[PDB]
């Protein structure tokens, strides 16, 4: 999933 990208998602 793209929303696990750490640049996008600081929780990942």
């Amino acid at each position, epitope marked *: 999933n793209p929303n696990a990208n750490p640049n996008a*998602n600081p929780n990942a």
Partner: antibody
Amino acid sequence: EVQLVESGGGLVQPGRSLRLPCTASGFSFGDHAMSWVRQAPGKGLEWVGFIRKTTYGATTHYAAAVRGRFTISRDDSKSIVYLQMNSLKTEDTAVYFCTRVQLDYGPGYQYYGMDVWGQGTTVTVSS
Amino acid sequence: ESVLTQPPSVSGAPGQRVTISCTGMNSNIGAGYDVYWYQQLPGRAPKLLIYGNSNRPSGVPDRFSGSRSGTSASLAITGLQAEDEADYYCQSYDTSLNGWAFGGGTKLTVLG
């Protein structure tokens, strides 16, 4: 009640520095990433940067417009996140909002919207 | 040059329905990054209104709904009330700029 209180804003000359503390209360501060957003007078929201939680190293990520001039740090022992603004420019004039990144779980990842916003502190850069 | 765009303004009559578009690109919404919506009442800080494309915070009423499709997203507001007048912003991560982009905001007028 969850609260975020920014402080430290005011008038500053171009080229000078200002540090904005944001004091958090009412939630488990150390579990959350925190994020700064700004809004110039009459204009739209612009994201500034985020800082991860300390168990992820409290690493940071910034918008290109401020990279190299603004940095973020956090002090979990005091429940404060700081925006350090160096070499300020007139176009940095804005209200600066401190925000909490949510922890709600989605389908295989955690969501990351800004679920709590402070009231903001006004920074005016002028000579 | 923006990667997310919104109409500058929308209006509707009391009790009616408006939609606010968030027009994105293959580098943001089209790549599957989720959309978040914020409501900013006049003189107030923004509030999270929709998260993860379509989810409402527990206290936000179902008059507000969010959807996506391809490279765009939409916020629908039904049963318009005067208290809904605000600026609405969409947000999504963009791979080409490597950061959270915001649309330009849409000012909602409720024609009272």
